[PDB]
Each structure stands twice: as structure tokens, then as C-alpha cells.
Design a binder for this molecule. Structure first.
Ligand code: FMN
Ligand code: SF4
Ligand code: SF4
Ligand code: SF4
Ligand code: SF4
Ligand code: SF4
Ligand code: FES
Ligand code: FES
Lengths: 54, 66, 59, 230, 212, 430, 41
């Protein structure tokens, strides 16, 4: 996963033995990570076709 | 009665809209038909504090603990 | 790593492992979890009611 | 005529004389993260979170109790400002224990919000982490003083508004217990207004203690009864 | 180190504590010093007088000082738990402090701790199973130009050796209180050879001064 | 000018270091106290301020601010509140040994100093905060103040002029940060010893909000001899930004650990060898040098063989300066355990206003205990470098600074010995 | 002249500090009042 415990959750070892990992686990699953304001669009090549999400 | 849940016959009781001003709120409330109340905004009042005022000489504003 | 039965666990030679910390009701994406919590005669925090809708559970 | 110039990131604004940096930053739109300050309490410089960088000076100064001299330029988004905030958020979570499940302040702890939005992601200090035995203020106030961040907010409140003088600091170094030395059941009026003063879960409501958690509880406007003021 | 009261009688007011009116004369001097309006400032010397009038201070002394100086008692408990002189535990007559931090440990302080240990018998921090030998190790006392040093009640002992320590031990058991000065020569802070410091007796009002 | 100078007698400012000819008001009158001080104090406080700013007196006690500019901060005009002088006689900083001997051997010159300092800024009274560990010398100072009053000499009609001036003695109750500048001011109020925030300066708000000031005993005692003695003859010693006869004293691993009064500019090597016995085992045997006392990083041997004892030279060597521990520690001792004991000292003596000093001295003490055991990886020691970069400048007082610097100095200079310690424990485990 | 001229502090007891300050209370300029007699009057 990423090198960021503000988007990906911390794993179990550091979760059970840290402090900030338990904080980021708890608020990451309750509140949800914040996402900056803006409008985006992207598309992948799904096997049907140009699968877009906006 | 089967689970102790809260069944409600209220479709609109879980809508909450976020606006930017009071005039657009009033305009939308009259536009979309229903009645409305305006609980006016009450901002925090500015005050004046200083640590040098916390350690005065004859004035009684004194923290007496730190 | 299958997802089936929805069991609960408990401590070795001990009482229940839950705390009613309500994280699972906050993260249940159909909100099938329902937790009502009280502490008992000890003082340690516990529950009263812990419900899963197996209909709404999407596993 | 008592209008002083500061530049918050280059934006000028006019300030009252003899006021703090923090009131000016709240005037223009910013918030500096703050713990030991509170706007109905007298200013103390305990928490060391109100830090910010003032240009053309090496020392990072506090901004809960810096009076605004003439012509400032305040760096709320420089490098060492965020580095100092990261450092102090690393220090405040050093001796604060793993109780975020069984706390009463899941959504409403200050430390969790400011640790996400302002502090580090990974911890350090593998060993240690002292523990403090709890007290018993009364049947209304559940008290777990292990979570106490030693902020000295409840003491100033008691001694300046309650006036009872029953909450003081005792000890030195790491070992500073806040409360009553003599096991006296602190019971007075406005004793319920101290479970909302305490920014962490150190002082919590006893008859509410383990029944809910703030995001499920929806909020509803109301007016008090049983008092002449409401 | 036990910062909670926990009544347990032989404590727990009212335990009978009482002064002498001559001590009230001392307190008249102490609150004669301070400016009027700040009677609440004599807490430290009045509380030290309480410690010297009762070798460990009770909590009834703390309430009585709070009654006299008209402050709420929690500030008195703050002052009495913050500092180091005020020993809330019941202690003995003589209070041995092995002073040991940086130069004292660097010049073999452990010799003195082990000497007091295996002569007195009891361990560090705790006390003897009688009075008058509460032993603790303490932080710096200031006089670092001498040995790892020994504080007994209002007395220093400097430039040590284990045998004069044994003399101090036996003479405190009997009752002979020795000199306040150091040992093994150099009766004060000295370059203990042959006076590389000043030698001539200074003149004073008989040489040049500048317009006064 | 001078070629960096050496020791020379009659350049000593204050005599009576130890065991001298007498001590009494008569002994002070013979040595040169209470000499024509009516002529000096009946002239004007701005004359003494001009004299001190002529002298270039460097403010002692390891802060670094000059004395004359601080006292010129005190020259706010006459308002409707009194003004106090607070003479701080504390010896924290294990080593310190500064004015214990001075206040036991010459209190009348201290009374001279506080009287001239009070006249030089319109002060109304003086509080002398002696350390509570010094009960015998507090009694001796009480005897001297008794005799000074008993001459009818200070108080009402002090030296002829109608100028009321008293001195009080307040003991400490055993602390470290009472030596600091503003926790002193709160502890004199009877509150528990805790400092204030600096941007309300003590020159306006002091003892309950009276404009007072704090001065150290070396500066106080040297102050009236600047008046009664030669104008900038005192400044003719060493350098010009900083000058004076300071108490360079050695307590550590030497023969006859002791005190000397010397010039500010002096080779530290020739000081250590040629004024306190010699380094035990010769010069080549010693491990390292600390100046400063305890708020100062350590110096290795090859650096200290070039060091002159000036403030600017030691800031160029990235250290400060203090009293009586300008010492070596020898090779056979563990400097790891020495600095770990210094950090244990800081943990046992620190107040707890600031979150970062409390938590940082906690981490540093537990981490140094692990390093004495030798049970970490080198990432931990560079993290210790990181935290000691995080503390400095984030505290109210400077005890956090004095705790952060020796860790910095140890990691600057004795890196491979710590690496070998950790490697020895790794082979012990394996 | 190498004879130690102190150790006149050899005979000081536990109370001589406070007794000395007590005997040194008079001829003192009056240590003024200021406003109320205390922060809580
Ligand atoms: C950590 C620390 C410890 C101090 N310890 C002492 C002390 O033991 N004695 C003292 O007189 N001043 C002490 N001071 C204060 C300094 O000496 C400072 O210079 C003083 O406030 C004014 O001295 P000056 O007259 O030289 O300017 C200490 C300051 C700090 C930051
Ligand atoms: S409430 Fe849910 S998430 Fe929390 S401990 Fe109990 S089962 Fe686990
Ligand atoms: S839907 Fe089922 S698996 Fe998913 S969170 Fe809810 S109870 Fe758990
Ligand atoms: S007060 Fe402590 S236990 Fe409670 S949420 Fe905050 S950090 Fe967690
Ligand atoms: S109990 Fe709460 S308000 Fe009081 S000092 Fe501790 S954290 Fe601060
Ligand atoms: S750094 Fe520590 S010792 Fe200094 S004022 Fe802050 S809390 Fe007290
Ligand atoms: S707000 Fe806590 S230090 Fe300024
Ligand atoms: S350390 Fe023992 S006297 Fe300073």
C-alpha cells in the first residue's frame, strides 16, 4: 500500500502497538479521509469499452 | 416491536441542505413551496485578552495558580 | 479467508471480546449493524443489543 | 487611530491594539490549532500548539499570547511551522494511551482530529508510556486521568469561574497529577460544565458514560427550562 | 512517589498539630516583610517553619497554615508537593543525602553509597527500622569542587573518605555532631597545594580609586 | 593591545576568595567596602548606566545578554508603582560552585552591589533569593545584613541621602528552575515555581506586576567596583565585546579541583594544567572537555587545544559558557553514563508547563538508558539527533535547550564509540 | 596569613535564621499597601 497512513489504513502490527496508527485507524474508518474539492473525470478500458467515471 | 428499531413514516425527516447565504435560503424556500423559519446567525463576539493583564497589580483579574 | 457465518469471539478462558466501540456500525455499508450499549454491574463497558441483518449484510 | 497592520500571507488586515495573533488569524479566516487556549478562559501558554513563524526572526514564537506589534507578516504555511506542529503532535501522543475504543470521545477528541490534519502518520518512542492512577471527583464526573494531556484547562476554569480551588497540579517532570490531593469529592454548581471544558476524555460524564458516540446522535436545537434564563 | 493522600490514621485531620506563640512572633516577622495586599506570598517560609517545627509536616499543619494565611488549601498542597525540602513521609531525626549527579558520580560516588549501605544496613530510598537514618540519594547540592558529598540536616560534608564516613556514622550513633567543614585538608574551597591564588594582603582605601 | 594575556594579581576585582584575613564590617572596611559610596550614589543613576555601558560588562550566568542594555531597559520613567531588584544566588548546573564561596566570604560587597544597582534604576527594595540548600550561608548573609543595618547605613537615610532601601533574604525550597529568570518571580510570589511567557517582558511586569529586574551575583558584586574603580580598566582584559575577570573553576578529574579568578581571554589548556594540579595521568590521557557547566555541549581534545575562553570563541566552537565545570573527563570513565546521568538529572528537575520539554526529556532519558545498555539500531541515534533538533526553541525556558544541546554534542563528537557499544551488545546477544 | 577566619557559623542552630530576621524587623521602611488587602478581599 501507500506510504501514507492518512489514506490507506495502518496494518495490524503497528495498529496494535502504536498510538497514531490506532488514531488514524479509528478516524479513517469512522470519518472517512477528506478529499480536496474539485471535479474530475477519468476512464479505463473496461472489456466493454471506455468505462468513464466522473 | 420485532427488533426495537426506529421505524418512521417520515420521508423528508432526513434531508439537510447546505447553503451559502440567508437570502438564497429564503428564495429557495419560497420557490420550492413550503414554509420556513429563520433562526438568525449568532457569531462569537470578539474579546481582548493578554497575559500582562493576567498578572496585574491591584486589579483582581488574577489567575492565582500559574 | 472466506466470509460466512458472522460469529463473535471471546477471550481465552474469559468473557466477551467486544467493547461496543460502534466502529462496525459506522463502517457497515448497508448499516445492518445495530449496537445499543450499556455497562453492567462491574464497570467495564459492554452492550445490550448487537444486531446484524443477514439480508442487508453484503459480506 | 489604533489600527495596526499585519500581513497574513501577504494579505493586509487592521488589528485592534494589544490583541493576540490568534484573534487576527480568526479574523481573516485561518485557524491555528490550539489546546490550552479557550476564549472564555484566561490565556496560558501551556500547550505549545499555537506556534507560527514570524518573518525576519529565527525563533518560532507562541501565538496565543503574543501581542501584535506593528507591521507583521505571519507564515502559517511555511516549512518550519508545519515541522514544529508535527513535532509537538508527536510529543502529545507519546504519553497518551490506547483507549480510543473505550473512550467516551470517539468523534469529539481534539487529539484525533488535530493528529490527522496536522501531525505525523507513524509514531516513534517504542518503549515507556507512563500511567497515572485515577481519582474520584464525584458520582457525576467519571475521571480517567491517564488520558489527561496535562493541559491545564480545567484548573483555570475552576479557579476563575467556580472559585472552589480544588483542582491543582501536583508533582514535577513527567509525573504531574492534576486534581485534588486530599481525595475530597469536588461537588459544586457548574460541575457539569467541566466535562465540556476537558478537551480530551480525561473528564467525562458519568450518567452518559457508555451509551452512545457522537456521530450517531443527531443534533437538535432547543431552549432550556427550569431556570429563568434558558 | 505517593502524591495522593489516602487518609490512613496517624494522618487524616484532625491529627493534633499546634504551634508556639513564639512561632507566631516569627510569622509576624515573615508577614511584616512582604507588601500589604500579598499576605498570600509567605507560604514558602511559613511552611518551612512548619517543617522545622515538626520534622515531617502533617496535613493538619497544611490546613493550619492555610487557615492563617487565608488561602484555600489546594495552593498550599501545590507548594508542599512541588519542592524537595518538604518531606510528607514521616522521617527520622537525621536525614542523610548522598549528593550524586555529574562530578560526584565521576569521582566515585558509589563508594559512598555502598559504604552507607553496608554499614547502616538498609537500602537506598527507604529508611532504617528506627529513627534518625533516612537515607536518600539526591541531585546536585551545588558544592561540586569537592567530593561526592554528604548532606545531613543543615550540614555539608566534603572531600570524603570511607573511614571518616565511618567516624561520622559512629559519632551520629553516639551523638557527636562533627564539623561543617570538609575533610582531608584544605579547610574550604582551595587549590590545595601552595596558593597559586592571591598572596599579598590588599590595600583598599590606600591606593588609586576613580573619583569616589 | 594584548597577546591574549595570562594571570596577574591586582587585576583581581574582588578579593577574599577563601580563608583570608577577616570578615566583618571592619574587615570589609579594611579590604575596601563602604568606601565613599555616598559620593557615587549622590551623583545620578544615568552616570552608573553610562559607566556600565562604558565597561562593556557581559552579563554572567550563561544567558549572554549584556548587563548595561538590560538595565537601560529598566529605565522606564516614574509611574505609580514601586520597583524591585532581585539578586539571584542560585547554583543549579551541577558543577556550578559560583557564588557559594563568594557569598560565604564577602557579603558586604554584595550589599554594595545591590545598593548601587538599586540606586542605578530607582529601585525601592531588593530581594535576595538564596538557594534553600545553603542554610548556613543564609545565616552568614543575615549576619552581614544585620551589621549593615546596625551601622544605620542602609534603610532610612541610606548613606546620608533620604533614600529608603531595604534588602530581604528569601530561601528557596529546593528546585532547579528557580535559578531561571521568571519562575523566580512567580516563586517569590508564593506560587509554585513555573516560568512566564517571555513577550510580556519582566521589565514591565514583575513581582505581582511591578517593574523589577533580576541580576546574578557575579554581575551584582562586580557592579560597584566599576563605579569606585577605573573606568574601562575592567574592560582592559581580553576582548572588547566581552571582558572581565570570570570564575574559571575546575571540578572534575584533576589534582586539587578549585577556583581561579582570571581574564576572559585565556588558553583553556594552560588554564587546566597550570592552575589546578594537572590532569590525572597527564594531558594525553583525558577523554574530553566540557565548558559551561551542564547547558553546554562537549569538546574533544584536538579542538580544545586551540580554544580561548571567550563567548565568541565558544559560539564559534558552537558552545556557551558557565561556571566551575570548565573541566575534562578522563578516558577510563564512560561519557555515555556521564551524559545519561545528566539527562536523568534534567528529568528529576524540570517543571511541566511545556508539553515538549517534559515529553522530550522523557524520550531522551529512556533512549539514553537503552544506549547505556546498547540496545538499538543506528536509525534510533539519528532519530535522537532529530528530536534534539525538535526541542530547541519550542520551550518556555531554556532548560529544554540545555537538555537538547549535550545530546547534540555527544552525537557530533562520539559517534563511533556509541556504534561500538551497540555492536558489543549485539555480539553479547548473539 | 593562613588561619581560617570563618566557622563562626559552627554554632548556628535550626532557628537562628528566623530569629535573626525576627530581631531584624524594626527600622524598616513601611512596605506599602496596594489596593485591596488580597486578591480576594
Ligand atoms: C536553565 C537555566 C538555569 C539558570 N540557573 C541559574 C542559577 O543557578 N543562578 C542564577 O543566578 N541564574 C541562573 N539562571 C539565569 C541566568 O543567570 C540569567 O543570566 C539571569 O536571569 C540574569 O543574569 P545576568 O545578570 O547575568 O543577566 C539560569 C537560567 C537558565 C535558563
Ligand atoms: S462494536 Fe463492532 S467493531 Fe467495535 S469491538 Fe464490537 S464488534 Fe468490534
Ligand atoms: S455488510 Fe456484513 S460484512 Fe459488510 S460491514 Fe456490514 S456486517 Fe460486516
Ligand atoms: S481522549 Fe485519548 S482515548 Fe479518548 S479519543 Fe482522545 S486520544 Fe483517544
Ligand atoms: S483533566 Fe482535562 S482539562 Fe484538566 S488538565 Fe487534564 S486534559 Fe486538561
Ligand atoms: S521547558 Fe520544561 S522546565 Fe522549562 S518552563 Fe517549560 S515545562 Fe518548565
Ligand atoms: S494556545 Fe496553548 S500555547 Fe498558545
Ligand atoms: S552534583 Fe553533588 S554537589 Fe553538584
Amino acid at each position: 500500500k501507500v506510504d501514507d497512513a492518512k489514506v490507506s489504513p495502518p496494518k495490524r502490527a503497528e495498529m496494535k502497538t502504536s498510538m497514531e496508527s490506532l488514531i488514524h485507524h479509528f478516524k479513517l474508518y469512522t470519518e472517512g479521509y477528506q478529499v480536496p474539492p474539485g471535479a474530475t473525470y477519468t476512464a479505463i478500458e473496461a472489456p466493454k469499452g471506455e468505462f468513464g467515471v466522473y | 416491536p420485532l427488533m426495537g428499531w426506529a421505524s418512521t413514516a417520515d420521508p423528508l425527516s432526513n434531508l439537510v441542505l447546505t447553503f451559502s447565504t440567508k437570502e438564497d435560503a429564503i428564495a429557495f424556500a419560497e420557490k420550492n413551496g413550503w414554509s420556513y423559519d429563520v433562526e438568525e446567525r449568532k457569531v462569537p463576539k470578539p474579546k481582548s485578552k493578554s497575559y500582562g493583564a493576567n498578572f496585574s497589580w491591584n486589579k483582581r483579574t488574577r489567575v492565582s495558580t500559574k | 479467508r472466506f466470509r460466512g457465518e458472522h460469529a463473535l469471539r471471546r477471550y481465552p478462558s474469559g468473557e466477551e471480546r467486544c467493547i461496543a466501540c460502534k466502529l462496525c456500525e459506522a463502517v457497515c455499508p448497508a448499516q445492518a449493524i445495530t449496537i445499543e450499549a450499556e455497562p453492567r454491574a462491574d464497570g467495564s463497558r459492554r452492550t445490550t443489543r448487537y444486531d446484524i441483518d443477514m439480508t442487508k449484510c453484503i459480506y | 487611530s489604533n489600527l495596526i497592520e499585519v500581513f497574513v500571507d501577504g494579505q493586509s488586515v487592521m488589528v485592534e491594539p494589544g490583541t493576540t495573533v490568534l484573534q487576527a488569524c480568526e479574523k481573516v479566516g485561518m485557524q491555528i490549532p490550539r489546546f490550552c487556549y479557550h476564549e472564555r478562559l484566561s490565556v496560558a501558554g501551556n500547550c505549545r500548539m499555537c506556534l507560527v513563524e514570524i518573518e525576519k526572526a529565527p525563533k518560532v514564537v507562541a501565538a496565543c499570547a503574543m501581542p501584535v506589534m506593528k507591521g507583521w507578516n505571519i507564515l502559517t504555511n511555511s516549512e518550519k511551522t508545519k515541522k514544529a506542529r508535527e513535532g509537538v503532535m508527536e510529543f502529545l501522543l507519546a504519553n497518551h494511551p490506547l483507549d480510543c475504543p473505550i473512550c467516551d470521545q470517539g468523534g469529539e477528541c481534539d487529539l484525533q482530529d488535530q493528529s490527522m490534519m496536522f501531525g505525523s502518520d507513524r509514531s516513534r518512542f517504542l518503549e515507556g508510556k507512563r500511567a497515572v492512577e485515577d481519582k474520584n471527583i464525584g458520582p457525576l464526573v467519571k475521571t480517567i486521568m491517564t488520558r489527561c494531556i496535562q493541559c491545564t484547562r480545567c484548573i483555570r476554569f475552576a479557579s476563575e469561574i467556580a472559585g472552589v480551588d480544588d483542582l491543582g497540579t501536583t508533582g514535577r517532570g513527567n509525573d504531574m497529577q492534576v486534581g485534588t490531593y486530599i481525595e475530597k469529592m469536588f461537588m459544586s454548581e457548574l460541575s457539569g460544565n467541566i466535562i465540556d471544558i476537558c478537551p480530551v476524555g480525561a473528564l467525562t460524564s458519568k450518567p452518559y458514560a457508555f451509551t452512545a458516540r457522537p456521530w450517531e446522535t443527531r443534533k437538535t436545537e432547543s431552549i432550556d427550562v427550569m431556570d429563568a434564563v434558558g | 512517589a505517593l502524591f495522593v493522600h489516602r487518609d490512613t490514621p496517624k494522618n487524616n485531620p484532625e491529627t493534633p498539630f499546634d504551634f508556639t506563640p513564639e512561632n507566631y512572633k516569627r510569622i509576624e516577622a515573615i508577614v511584616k516583610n512582604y507588601p500589604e495586599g500579598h499576605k498570600a506570598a509567605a507560604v514558602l517560609p511559613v511552611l518551612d517553619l512548619a517543617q522545622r517545627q515538626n520534622g515531617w509536616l502533617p496535613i493538619s499543619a497544611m490546613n493550619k497554615v492555610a487557615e492563617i494565611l487565608q488561602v484555600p488549601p489546594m495552593r498550599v498542597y501545590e507548594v508542599a508537593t512541588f519542592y524537595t525540602m518538604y518531606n510528607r513521609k514521616p522521617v527520622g531525626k537525621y536525614h542523610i543525602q548522598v549528593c550524586t549527579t555529574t562530578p560526584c558520580m565521576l569521582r566515585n560516588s558509589d563508594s559512598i553509597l555502598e559504604a552507607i549501605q553496608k554499614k547502616l544496613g538498609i537500602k537506598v530510598g527507604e529508611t532504617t527500622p528506627d529513627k534518625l537514618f533516612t537515607l536518600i540519594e539526591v541531585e546536585c547540592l551545588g558544592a561540586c569542587v569537592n567530593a561526592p558529598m554528604v548532606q545531613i540536616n543543615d550540614n555539608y560534608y566534603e572531600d570524603l573518605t570511607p573511614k571518616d564516613i565511618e567516624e561520622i556514622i559512629d559519632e551520629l550513633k553516639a551523638g557527636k555532631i562533627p564539623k561543617p567543614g570538609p575533610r582531608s585538608g584544605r579547610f574550604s574551597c582551595e587549590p590545595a597545594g601552595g596558593l597559586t591564588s592571591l598572596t599579598e594582603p590588599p590595600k583598599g582605601p590606600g591606593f588609586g580609586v576613580q573619583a569616589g | 593591545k594584548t597577546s591574549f594575556g595570562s594571570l596577574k594579581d591586582e587585576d583581581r576585582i574582588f578579593t577574599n576568595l577563601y580563608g583570608r584575613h577577616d570578615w566583618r564590617l571592619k574587615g570589609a572596611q579594611s579590604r575596601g567596602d563602604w568606601y565613599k559610596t555616598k559620593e557615587i550614589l549622590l551623583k545620578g543613576p544615568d552616570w552608573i548606566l553610562g559607566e556600565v555601558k562604558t565597561s562593556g560588562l557581559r552579563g554572567r550566568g550563561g544567558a549572554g545578554f549584556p548587563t548595561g542594555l538590560k538595565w537601560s531597559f529598566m529605565n522606564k520613567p516614574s509611574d505609580g508603582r514601586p520597583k524591585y531588584l532581585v539578586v539571584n544566588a542560585d547554583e543549579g548546573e551541577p558543577g556550578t560552585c559560583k557564588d557559594r564561596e563568594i557569598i560565604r566570604h564577602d557579603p558586604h560587597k554584595l550589599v554594595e552591589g545591590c545598593l548601587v544597582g538599586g540606586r542605578a534604576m530607582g529601585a525601592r527594595a531588593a530581594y535576595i533569593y538564596i538557594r534553600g540548600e545553603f542554610y548556613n550561608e543564609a545565616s552568614n548573609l543575615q549576619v552581614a545584613i544585620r551589621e549593615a543595618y546596625e551601622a544605620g547605613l542602609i534603610g532610612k537615610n541610606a548613606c546620608g541621602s533620604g533614600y529608603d532601601f531595604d534588602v530581604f533574604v528569601v530561601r528557596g525550597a529546593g528546585a532547579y528552575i528557580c535559578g531561571e529568570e521568571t519562575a523566580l518571580i512567580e516563586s517569590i510570589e508564593g506560587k509554585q515555581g513555573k516560568p512566564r511567557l517571555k513577550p510580556p517582558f519582566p521589565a514591565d511586569v514583575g513581582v505581582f506586576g511591578c517593574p523589577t529586574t533580576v541580576a546574578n551575583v557575579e554581575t551584582v558584586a562586580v557592579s560597584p567596583t566599576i563605579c569606585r574603580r577605573g573606568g574601562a580598566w575592567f574592560a582592559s582584559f581580553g576582548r572588547e565585546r566581552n571582558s572581565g575577570t570570570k570564575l574559571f573553576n575546575i571540578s572534575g578529574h584533576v589534582n586539587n579541583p578549585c577556583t581561579v579568578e582570571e581574564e576572559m581571554s585565556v588558553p583553556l589548556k594552560e588554564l587546566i594544567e597550570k592552575h589546578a594540579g594537572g590532569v590525572t595521568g597527564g594531558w594525553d590521557n583525558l577523554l574530553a572537555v566540557i565548558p559551561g557547566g551542564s547547558s553546554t555541549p562537549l569538546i574533544p581534545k584536538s579542538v580544545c587545544e586551540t580554544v580561548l575562553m571567550d563567548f565568541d570563541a565558544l559560539i564559534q566552537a558552537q558552545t556557551g559558557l558557565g561556571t566551575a565545570a570548565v573541566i575534562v573527563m578522563d578516558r577510563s570513565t564512560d561519557i555515555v553514563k556521564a551524559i545519561a546521568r545528566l539527562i536523568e538529572f534534567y528529568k528529576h528537575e524540570s517543571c511541566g508547563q511545556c508539553t515538549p520539554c517534559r515529553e522530550g526529556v522523557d524520550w531522551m532519558n529512556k533512549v539514553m538508558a537503552r544506549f547505556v545498555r546498547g540496545d538499538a539500531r543506528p536509525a534510533e541515534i539519528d532519530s535522537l539527533w532529530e528530536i534534539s533538533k525538535q526541542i530547541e526553541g519550542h520551550t518556555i525556558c531554556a532548560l529544554g535547550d540545555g537538555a537538547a544541546w549535550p545530546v547534540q554534542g555527544l552525537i557530533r563528537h562520539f559517534r563511533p564509540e556509541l556504534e561500538e557499544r551497540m555492536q558489543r551488545f549485539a555480539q553479547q546477544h548473539q | 596569613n593562613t588561619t581560617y577566619k570563618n566557622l563562626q557559623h559552627h554554632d548556628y542552630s535550626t532557628y537562628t535564621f528566623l530569629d535573626l530576621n525576627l530581631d531584624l524587623s524594626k527600622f524598616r521602611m513601611p512596605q506599602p499597601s496596594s489596593g485591596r488587602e488580597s486578591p480576594r478581599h
